Symmetry: C5
Subunit: 307 residues, 5 copies
């Protein structure tokens, strides 16, 4: 059935909204997330007019539901219409429970302190008889009172009718932009990734307050092994990230500091075996303060360069 | 076919129940579990009335089965109707074997001693001619006499007709709440996760009853490596859990105690090499009792703070 | 088309059988296995009677094939009928190549020496006009002459028409029980899991025939690390098993023996440094024989308690 | 539409062939491989005869394509007919691009030097009016000029019309056998699996040219840890293989040699501490040559027993 | 509906193009990548001619869309037509949003400095009434202004109408070649794979500036363990690659250099214990410069042999 033509040849406005239900999948490796939600559409048409008797109501296929199609989805959405209603004044609104995979990029520049923006794009199948324009119902758009992206904080949930569109579309269409900006609770990462990685480094550094090579070399190289094994343990948390992250920059600094610690221990032993205990003691005493200070500085510059 | 209108314009009650069969999938990482079960529905209608001859019986599509739709499912349920029957007094009951993924959150605040509640939500496609209300058949709802969630204990299986519903639904509907509360057999975890993690720590602590740095540092750092490798081994059991768990809090305490053990061994060696054997002996003898006592205390406070 | 009514109002018997082809998937983590097989059904009906000319034969949908439905399947079976035949005396037999996931529990109480029983359940959609009862064709049921569950031994393949059924079914139905009991070739596990796990333990024990603490502690703790790493290597073989297995009990005994070995080495060093070489020598010499004997005993009790 | 009856009541021959395109999936763990290929069928029928005008040609469903069904497939093939043609003399040949998972067993008796045979089985739905027999078109069967199973060498690609068939089929059918025999390029495995595994063993053996227990025990047990970690690294390459492989036999020999090396180092230290330096020196000097020679011998017997 | 016959019996040209949207999946292990894109087709037909009134426009099935079929796809593409338009002069162009898995080989000869070429192949279902030839619309073909293969650089995106085709096709068809040549940002790999692998090697080499066997052997073998563990950590980045890669050649050189380092340390200790300190000092001093120089040389030859 053709869409109802406008009375005054004015573009038809459709009020669309989403109330998220489950955001269950966040596949960082696949750079996608799977969401279940109730898509609500409102089209004002002069059809199925109601009489002042037995009112309040219809059919799943007999009423023209406009073609609302997502853009950034892997496959076509698995939709299931739940309710279809028509306002007797002529405002047909219907809600469909749909499951959809969303193809959105997650940048981990600032993991685990990241704050990302999931994106959903909407388009319509405009027809020559009547153009279709999209708006957003503020009273309808919202987020679930449920778990709501467990382990994340929903910072904002906004919609913008972006006039921009890809050049392939010969005509111009008002692509609709749902942007959901979410931060991450970073607290658990402090004792699960960051603090032990520093404890191992400090165990490495305590080799300076020692003086025996056979113990310094063990205390440094074994803690290097511990750090590598802990990196193996942590890499299940981290995603693939083919680019220089922030954690991937701290970890490189830590490898570099293990290298410098080994270099120092070797130089101290070489000086002390070459009958120069004075210089060896001097360099060890200097590094006792130098290493933590250099580490603190390097982390400060790293943070300011990434934040 | 339209649902049978009420004789006295009273809401139609439907007796619904589930007898679980297989709960085979418990994908902790995906925060979902897949269940197979027999959904049984009972609608009282004045249709297909039976005669006192050749009674006891029908069709899969010729009889109006009410639209029972789950809420918290990834995709629409993969149903397969098994039996359809009608009581000659007018009570049509039918059972459908359905497979369904369920999107429910599992909180691991208290893993492995957790006790969670799986949730199933039911809604109907109410029509204006006759409203639909849902109840629960106690004689029909039940759990399988089979394996019944292997590795778990089914504490309770209850149903509540919650008047609450999400604000998107313009009308009001009686969403139906199946809550299945299950505890976990925690015994195997005691020798598979907890006890070896303590054995390694005690091997670390036995470095206090020693007096040689070249052996204390080995005995501590190598056991740190052993603990990290054992954490790698155990993390297959644990799920992702982007939040401070209970095991994730014991493990942090253990990393902290390895740090303090290394700090002590270093201080003892530094004192003993700086011609103060008395203070070194005193601190070692004190820590021999201090470390186990502090560990026991810290676990007590950790348990009371998590339980 | 309705099933043919009985001539003498006697229940209709159906001869059913399965000849397995591929058992390709054995997903221990998912507690399921995927099997491909030829399901053969034989129903005796007075339809499509043959004449003594051009005999020996039909249609995929024009002949009533009884509704044979599996019970313990994740999704409905992916069937594909291959042959449909009718015996001129009136015995229609047809074979369908079907792929099916089977939801069966595998208990690893006795891994790797386990001997499990896969289960397939069959039910029919009995109609009021004529009841349906199921039997088994011994001449038709069988297992593939092919690989036949590679790495397993098929002990038995039997069928029982169990009168028992779940209480949800209001009527009584003769659920059909295919039980396939299979043992496991355990030989490869002896050099792949068990023997190296003992070699590492013996390397740990050879620390008793030594007398230097700096070497005993290395030889014990490094072999503890080796054992943990080997456990990591082996856990790909083992499934999740949320319960105390047999291998999971040997491994706990091994962790306990590493703990006791460390305790002994520490006590021996403490005695020998406290000017009591006699008692230290006595305890070391005693443990040289005590440890292997205690291990052998503990394994004997463990086996008798698990077998 | 019924197949064309024979003119002289002779069995109908069908010329079938496959030109492989992609063999993309080789899931060793699942014991299956997924292949894309063009299945070409040629049936000679007296239908759609061509006239000497506008010749050279049809329809996807109006012409009887014989039921060619694979046997060893997980699910039914995902076919897509590409071209359908009929020779004016009466030889209709058509090619369908089909994707199919194949359930074939891969035996790793001789990994990585294995040479396996993938198998595809073909059957037809023979009808009583005219029997169907299958042959092979040599001019049509072939392998892709493309990558062609990357990392493998296609040794042979042959077809045999095996008269044998499973006993379930009441009649006799000529099951068609495509066997594709492929060897493996084993070169990369020499530096990726085999050579480092020997380098670690040689590092272990260099403990004989030493004389200090505190260094011999480290050099042996730490290399045992290195070997276990390298086995963890390599096990991603190896498949599950629930049976004694060839690599799984070298690795057992290597564990045994680590055990014997530890035993020797302990015996040498015990002799040298028990005031018998002569015997300790003798046993060390003997083992310096004994260990490599025994290893070379044992590998020779292992190869002859597996090859 | 038959395709429109040519007016002058000339082959019909179709202008086809692709504007990529998401290249979300790059499954190196599966040797495939999944892409979402808008396929745009332009066929010039003398149908649906427009009048100079209410112009600018149609139907999804009433207009003959030519059969454009990809070649190198796992399954048939999951298409969804978005827009269908006809130019009043007679140039019908339509765009379909399609999701497709692409089976293309990725060679990692030069990982991580690789530069690969993804391939898409197009064919048509040519009919005898009118032949079909394919061209490319430069103004339509393009790549997304979006993320555009995150972690990769799109070097080129070209199309060639290759006259070549596989020999199975009895006729000749103009297979269409989209080749997308993409390089990889290799920077992050320098601190994530390459630099730490060298830091560990340098820590190994600093054993030459030492003189105690009990420390040299620890410093070398423990760093061998660290290198193996780091290889385990890195192998998540690397794909399966059953062939001698470039990283897989550096890693072999590194294992070889660990072997030579152990051999040297053993020889130095053996010389120094055999009352030849002069030769031991000479060989150690020589290797101090020999090892880094040999490593630099070997990397140069390795690069020139792989680049």
């Amino acid at each position: 059935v053709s869409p109802p033509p406008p009375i005054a040849d004015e573009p038809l406005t459709v009020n669309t909204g989403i109330y998220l239900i489950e955001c269950y999948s966040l596949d960082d490796k696949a750079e996608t997330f799977k969401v279940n939600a109730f898509l609500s559409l409102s089209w004002k048409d002069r059809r199925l007019a109601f009489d002042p008797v037995r009112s309040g109501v219809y059919e799943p296929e007999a009423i023209w539901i406009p073609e609302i199609r997502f853009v950034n989805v892997e496959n076509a959405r698995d939709a299931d219409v739940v309710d279809i209603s028509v306002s007797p004044d002529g405002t047909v609104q219907y809600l469909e429970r749909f499951s959809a995979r969303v193809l959105s990029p997650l940048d981990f520049r600032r993991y685990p302190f990241d704050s990302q923006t999931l994106h959903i794009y909407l388009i319509v199948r405009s027809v020559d008889t009547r153009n279709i324009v999209l708006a957003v119902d503020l009273e309808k758009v919202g987020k679930n009172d449920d778990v709501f992206l467990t382990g994340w904080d929903i910072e904002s949930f906004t919609a913008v009718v972006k006039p921009a569109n890809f050049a392939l579309e010969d005509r111009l269409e008002s692509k609709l932009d749902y942007q959901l900006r979410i931060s991450r609770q970073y607290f658990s990462y402090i004792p699960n990734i960051i603090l032990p990685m520093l404890f191992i480094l400090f165990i490495s550094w305590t080799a300076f307050w020692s003086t025996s090579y056979e113990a310094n070399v063990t205390l440094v190289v074994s803690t290097l092994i511990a750090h590598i094994a802990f990196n193996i343990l942590v890499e299940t948390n981290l995603p693939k990230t083919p680019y220089m992250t922030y954690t991937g920059a701290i970890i490189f600094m830590i490898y570099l500091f293990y290298f410098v610690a080994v270099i120092e221990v070797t130089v101290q032993h070489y000086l002390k075996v070459e009958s120069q205990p004075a210089r060896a003691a001097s360099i060890t005493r200097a590094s006792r303060i130098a290493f933590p200070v250099v580490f603190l500085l390097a982390n400060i510059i790293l943070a300011f360069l990434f934040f």
